[PDB]
Structure 1
Amino acid sequence: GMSHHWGYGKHNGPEHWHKDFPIAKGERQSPVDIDTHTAKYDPSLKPLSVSYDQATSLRILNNGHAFNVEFDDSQDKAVLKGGPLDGTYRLIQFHFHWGSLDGQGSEHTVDKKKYAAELHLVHWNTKYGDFGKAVQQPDGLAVLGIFLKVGSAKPGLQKVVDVLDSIKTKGKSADFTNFDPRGLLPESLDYWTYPGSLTTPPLLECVTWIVLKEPISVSSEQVLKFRKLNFNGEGEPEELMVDNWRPAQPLKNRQIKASF
């Protein structure tokens, strides 16, 4: 990806991605709009199992598109299982997509409603050995998506908000140990699920999406800080990191299943 030049601006944004990543117009692209009335309850869906008690965070990185909180995934320490999944999926990192305004920012939408942001906890299927091999498989990744709305602060998110000052620009990273991702989950684990893709290039169709119904609330001050990050590297013209979300894509031949 040393020669990639995609982003979220008018000249290299989502409408341009297909020229270098033709799968952008594929059969199972993400995100999608979740039409709550058309999604069907699926009694065969097992309960979701989120086991993050032994999670080991390591670092937080601004990669020029968003910021990732990375985890040690060399052992089964933080895994997602159950729900629509077969097997064990390991947490490798989480990041967010957000807007320039509270009225937009999420990638998935619910009955066309856009949330202020969306958290993505990325996990890979351990049967494939490593993340690089997993992204080459139809069932290689499981991404847990959680909507963020603006209201009360999310206590569990503050440590993230406070370290952003240290990774303002692209390429900067900072030690970020002992962060507990369980502090970012809503109370209920009710979800919608459908087969999809990574929402940024390479847009590989290797994701089982699990989107929680219940959003979490964050304060205006918390999301305000996200909006102070930069897409650019240090010493470059400042372009605020905002609206780093891909709009909803055609559902095509897919059905969204509800666990409730």
Structure 2
Amino acid sequence: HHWGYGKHNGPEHWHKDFPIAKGERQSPVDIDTHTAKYDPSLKPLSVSYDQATSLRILNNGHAFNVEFDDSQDKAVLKGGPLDGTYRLIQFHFHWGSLDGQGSEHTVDKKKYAAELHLVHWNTKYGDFGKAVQQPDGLAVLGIFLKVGSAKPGLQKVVDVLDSIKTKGKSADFTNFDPRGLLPESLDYWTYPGSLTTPPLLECVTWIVLKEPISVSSEQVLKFRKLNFNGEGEPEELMVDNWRPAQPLKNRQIKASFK
């Protein structure tokens, strides 16, 4: 029926409705650190989020998205392997039912507790919907989360989750600064890939940061209290909303560092 992360509608079934699931540039992938090519031609990333305007948080039934005003160049990403300016539209996470799983990308087969995706679209295409139809339409920054110390900048998100527990619920979420979610270092790996949920379009330049951020056990516990279902439907906790690693095929992962 409709796609999800269960036994009957999970990632191994997606190809029946979205054949591109077996495509040549699907994400996520495992990052083999000894095979990644250092590329000295890659520039440092430029993250300009000081004028970011968050608007709302929404449970869409597969994750929770924090959405931003993308009608102007307020929160943008440029540099790195990118040509042009990419505007932030939303961020969301993928997480597990246990601390030893949850991330989509892996590093030398190591899985993290969760993975944050900051989604941006190439302004040359005018809107998000046109951007997803192009090979260079989106840039996603992926950041791993490990369990350890609490991340103060994540607490405002954790605290509003009770108000969007079920699918289709939304809440006003203004004045949230996404700078509180970045690691200290911006070293990264990059490769050409896709969206990790249907429609699985191959329009993404992924930028995965080497340095994870730490979150407390209590913080991730609050993520696992969300629901996949809508209000008044049988409760299905929102956990393990990650797609496993896909074949690298004819692709090279480049590193911005050595």
TM-score tier, shorter chain, comes to over 0.9
Spell out, residue by residue over 1:74-107, the C-alpha distance to the aligned partner (whole angstroms, 9 max, x if none): 0000000000000000000000000000000000
Match of 1:143 in 2: 140
* SS of aligned partner of 2:11: coil
Provide the C-alpha distance between the structure 1 equivalents of 2:182 and 2:45, rounded to a whole number of angstroms: 13
How many Å apart are 1:70 and its aligned residue? Answer: 0.1
Provide the C-alpha distance between the structure 1 equivalents of 2:234 and 2:84, rounded to a whole number of angstroms: 46
* SS of aligned partner of 1:59: strand
5+ residue gaps, structure 1: none
- Give yes or no for the alignment of 1:223 onto 2:220: yes
How many Å apart are 1:204 and its aligned residue? Answer: 0.1
How many Å apart are 1:206 and its aligned residue? Answer: 0.2
Spell out, residue by residue over 1:21-60, the C-alpha distance to the aligned partner (whole angstroms, 9 max, x if none): 0000000000000000000100000110000000000000
Counterpart mapping for 1:12-161 below 5 A: 12-161=9-158
Provide the C-alpha distance between the structure 1 equivalents of 2:167 and 2:124, rounded to a whole number of angstroms: 33
How many Å apart are 1:109 and its aligned residue? Answer: 0.2
How many Å apart are 1:126 and its aligned residue? Answer: 0.1
Identity within the alignment, %: 100
How many Å apart are 1:16 and its aligned residue? Answer: 0.2
Match of 1:165 in 2: 162
How many Å apart are 1:164 and its aligned residue? Answer: 0.1
Provide the C-alpha distance between the structure 2 equivalents of 1:190 and 1:47, rounded to a whole number of angstroms: 8
How many Å apart are 1:181 and its aligned residue? Answer: 0.3
Task: Give the CA RMSD over aligned residues.
Answer: 0.5
5+ residue gaps, structure 2: none
How many Å apart are 1:182 and its aligned residue? Answer: 0.4
Match of 1:248 in 2: 245
How many Å apart are 1:188 and its aligned residue? Answer: 0.2
Counterpart mapping for 1:191-210 below 5 A: 191-210=188-207
How many Å apart are 1:172 and its aligned residue? Answer: 0.2
* SS of aligned partner of 1:105: coil
* SS of aligned partner of 2:248: coil
How many Å apart are 1:119 and its aligned residue? Answer: 0.1
How many Å apart are 1:193 and its aligned residue? Answer: 0.1
* SS of aligned partner of 2:111: coil
Provide the C-alpha distance between the structure 1 equivalents of 2:185 and 2:65, rounded to a whole number of angstroms: 24
Aligned residues: 257
How many Å apart are 1:68 and its aligned residue? Answer: 0.1
Provide the C-alpha distance between the structure 2 equivalents of 1:47 and 1:213, rounded to a whole number of angstroms: 13
TM-score when scaled to structure 1?
0.98
**1:176 pairs with 173, 178, 194, which one?**
173
Provide the C-alpha distance between the structure 1 equivalents of 2:219 and 2:231, rounded to a whole number of angstroms: 23
Deviating 4+ runs (over 6 angstroms): none
How many Å apart are 1:219 and its aligned residue? Answer: 0.2
Provide the C-alpha distance between the structure 2 equivalents of 1:41 and 1:182, rounded to a whole number of angstroms: 27
* SS of aligned partner of 1:36: coil
